[model samples]
Target: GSSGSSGIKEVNQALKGHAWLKDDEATHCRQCEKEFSISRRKHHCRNCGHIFCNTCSSNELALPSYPKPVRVCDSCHTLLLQRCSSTAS
Candidate 1:
């Protein structure tokens, strides 16, 4: 759980300036079932345990606005954070 957050954060950091990280290499999205490319972003849905591209899972899809706060993947967001904290300790 917590590991998921750290994993996501690490991936996010690595992909900060870079648009996308190659998939089918290290960590790949299970939902999309495709390798992440340099043109897309991978997102993990904490709710359904589904992993998809940014377009599929980005927070931009909110109902109220476009640039809203990132959506929580699901109920596992906190769990992922906690796991990350523990591992770092």
Candidate 2:
């Protein structure tokens, strides 16, 4: 038999203060000033749930509540990693 492996756990304290911004209400990418178009579609940041264009929201990382990689914005990427890494000890 194989050795037991630890299961994944979520950070229950990771607060979600921001509400999901409606896609129809946003017209441009949150990171860049590029206007939204057929090619540049809207994507929601898993961390903030804000609408961002595909290019701006291209990053994918595992969030506190999510065990699998999920789509996140460029800004959220750094913030999540920075704070999360602090507890890696």
Candidate 3:
């Protein structure tokens, strides 16, 4: 599990806001500037559906939604955790 486990539940909300992108429309990692080996060889975040790379956005966390350790993008990771803690009462 990733440190973002704190936002595991909150992160799942991303399913409504973010959707998977078309393969042909993808370019490079949304976090790291490094280009993908192939034009469409980018990885996607399970929670947010954003494109990223292993070196920059590789964060595997076990959430309630997925039965296995799923990947999430970098920004979404921090944002999810941030919102979760901020809204905690």
Candidate 4:
């Protein structure tokens, strides 16, 4: 559960899993197995640090551990009940 918010914020210095994968080390979106491209670029799940396409990772969520919701991949999907998503897309 998210609280319905959008926009980017600097990763919280103390937050967990905010560490992103090195761009070069990543070649595809881990969630959908899609190849990387200009449009479907890599997006990081603030909670997992895993890579995903903008489409696969499009859910902006408010993590209970963070100060605000962020562009987190829905990979945590039904698995994350406490992590909210205002939309299903």
> What is candidate 4's TM-score against the reference?
0.57
Model 4 alpha-carbon drift over 4 Å, by segment: 1-24, 82-89
RMSD of 4: 20.3
Off by over 4 Å in 2: 1-24, 84-89
lDDT of candidate 1 over 1-89, digit per residue (tens): 35543334343334447566564543665545565688877665544546666655644222222355455453344444554343342
Rank by lDDT, descending? 2, 4, 3, 1
Error of 4 at 82 (Å): 7.9
lDDT of each: 0.51, 0.78, 0.65, 0.73
The better-scoring model by lDDT among 1 and 4 is: 4
Each candidate structure's TM-score, on Cα atoms with residue i matched to residue i, is 0.29, 0.62, 0.51, 0.57
Runs in model 3 deviating more than 4 A are 1-24, 38-41, 85-89
Displacement of the residue 28 alpha carbon in candidate 2, Å: 1.2
Which of the two candidates, 2 or 4, achieves a greater TM-score against the reference?
2
Separate clash counts for every candidate: 6, 0, 0, 3
lDDT by residue for model 2 over 1-89, one digit each (tens)? 78988999877676668865554678666678687999888897777888888888878897657889888898888777676465553
Give the range of the ten consecutive residues with the poorest summed lDDT in model 2.
Answer: 80-89
Candidate 1 segments whose C-alpha is farther than 4 A from its true place: 1-34, 59-89
Q: Which lDDT value does model 3 have at 29? A: 63
- Give candidate 3's TM-score: 0.51
Model 3: per-residue Cα lDDT over 1-89, one tens digit each: 55643434443443456766545555656656666785336667777777677775656666556898777777776777666544443
lDDT at 58 for candidate 1? 46
